Design a protein around this ligand. Structure first.
Ligand SMILES: Nc1ccn([C@H]2C[C@H](O)[C@@H](COP(=O)(O)OP(=O)(O)OP(=O)(O)O)O2)c(=O)n1
Ligand SMILES: [Ca+2]
Ligand SMILES: [Ca+2]
Ligand SMILES: [Ca+2]
Length: 438
DNA sequence: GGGGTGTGGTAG
DNA sequence: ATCGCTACCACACCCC
């Protein structure tokens, strides 16, 4: 066991943290895209008419961890057992659950302790460990298969297990549902073969937003083709409000307050007005939802098609550590800040940039919150504080950056024993060119 | 019109 | 036990 004051803490935490893995895998996929396209264009233009195939592994970690499970789980049945992937036994996140588990109401992100209560007696939850390297290998097979099929003009990485794949249709060609279904079935079968048993679902449409909703309707282990010309009340009635991309729990709560608790996207689209929507959730998010309820993308979402190199380019670099943070004094806090800045500077030098602006953010135990929260080593209920600094000259120098980060910590006034989380951010990245003469 | 700050929220 | 990350738009509210 490795405590936060141990030099090996960051290495250990990132080795175990699935959320760190997701972030790192996504960042690597974006960098790979940029490196592979440095001399190519491969951007969608205004003259192109396109179809979106949104392809995503079903219950990704649960599927892979099952297929790669150790001999102690040899008898586990993926079709009949409720399966989760997690580290622990109580207040530990279910990173992924299979569709048997979801039949009982279990969802990704739930704690094991919450999920166990949803099972009737005699039904036992199977908890599989993470298989991080094999998650990545299955991802490799997925992205390799997509490219090998030679059916897409543009393949955009969304996640370790998910890609937006764009097919341009010439005016030349009469696209049909039958042709799209055959492509869906080819993709699904080739990925199933190429990954040695993992399944993907596919949403197929003429917008990014409808392709995402079609993907949800397709799952598990299926495909759905719903173009704007195919839209119906039956389609909209099939979705919850937070099935919309960009709508999470906070936005959902506002929509339910404003529109008398709609229970489907059909309820919402029959009740809303654009003006009332903007007043409830904000101008830009309101417009996004209004357009989505017509099956249409907003301008911000379309940028990934028309300028993927800009959208996928990294603009900031940070670490966040909000688990395991228990320091007794400022000396140990300062050493942790130094270790984090060393880690960040290794990443910054790998991309050959400097930074011009940095931020320290912290989580501090709320005055009335227990010192030991419900989740072992968790941050618990906290107040957040952050402060940024503009550096005089863009730099990659540890002495400058770590000294200023430690200064920023002091300005926020958090006693070491009350600290529950820390974020170190390089907010603005600056190119390094061949001319460095003053 | 231009700039700045810290914070909210989402995704996977 | 248990590994609650992290990029990035949008916002509110401040300056000239
Ligand atoms: N709260 C979450 C959500 C996702 N993930 C990890 C594990 C997921 O398997 C993987 C992909 O996320 P998805 O949202 O695509 O979810 P799944 O693939 O598990 O299920 P599905 O896509 O079938 O709904 O990211 C996680 O660790 N914690
Ligand atoms: Ca998935
Ligand atoms: Ca996914
Ligand atoms: Ca959503």
């Amino acid at each position: 066991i490795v405590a936060c004051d141990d030099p090996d803490f960051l290495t250990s935490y990132f080795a175990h943290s699935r959320l760190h893995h997701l972030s790192a895998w996504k960042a690597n996929l974006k960098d790979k895209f940029l490196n592979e396209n440095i001399h190519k264009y491969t951007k969608i233009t205004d003259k192109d008419t396109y179809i979106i195939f949104h392809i995503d592994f079903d219950c990704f970690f649960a599927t892979v961890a099952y297929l790669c499970r150790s001999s102690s789980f040899s008898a586990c049945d993926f079709k009949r057992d409720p399966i989760v992937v997690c580290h622990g036994t109580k207040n530990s996140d279910i990173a992924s659950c299979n569709y048997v588990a979801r039949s009982y109401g279990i969802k990704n992100g739930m704690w094991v302790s919450q999920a166990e209560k949803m099972l009737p007696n005699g039904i036992k939850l199977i908890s599989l460990p993470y298989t991080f390297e094999q998650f990545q290998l299955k991802s490799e097979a997925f992205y390799s298969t997509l490219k090998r099929l030679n059916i897409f003009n543009l393949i955009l990485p969304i996640s370790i297990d998910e890609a937006v794949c764009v097919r341009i249709i010439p005016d030349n060609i009469h696209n049909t549902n039958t042709l799209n279904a055959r492509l869906c079935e080819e993709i699904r079968q080739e990925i199933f073969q190429g990954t040695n048993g993992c399944t993907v679902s596919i949403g197929c449409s003429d917008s990014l937003v409808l392709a995402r909703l079609a993907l949800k309707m397709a799952k598990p282990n299926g495909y759905n083709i719903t173009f704007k010309s195919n839209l119906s009340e039956e389609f909209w009635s099939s979705f919850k409000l937070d099935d919309l991309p960009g709508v999470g729990h906070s936005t959902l709560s506002r929509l339910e307050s404003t529109f008398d608790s709609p229970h489907s996207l059909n309820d919402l689209r029959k009740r809303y007005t654009l003006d009332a929507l903007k007043a409830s959730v904000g101008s830009k998010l309101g417009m996004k939802i209004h357009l989505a309820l017509q099956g249409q993308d907003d301008e911000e979402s379309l940028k990934i098609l028309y300028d993927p190199k800009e959208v996928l380019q990294r603009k900031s670099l940070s670490i966040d550590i909000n688990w395991g943070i228990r320091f007794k004094n400022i000396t140990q806090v300062d050493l942790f800040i130094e270790r984090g800045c060393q880690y960040l500077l290794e990443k910054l030098n790998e991309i050959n940039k400097t930074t011009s602006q940095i931020t320290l953010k912290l989580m501090r135990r709320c005055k009335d919150a227990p010192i030991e929260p419900p989740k072992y080593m968790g941050m618990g209920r906290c107040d957040s504080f952050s402060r940024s600094s503009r550096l005089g000259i863009p730099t990659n120098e540890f002495g400058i950056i770590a000294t200023e980060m430690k200064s920023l910590y002091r300005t926020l006034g958090c006693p070491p024993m009350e600290l529950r989380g820390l974020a170190l951010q390089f907010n603005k990245l600056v190119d390094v060119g061949p001319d460095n003469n003053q």
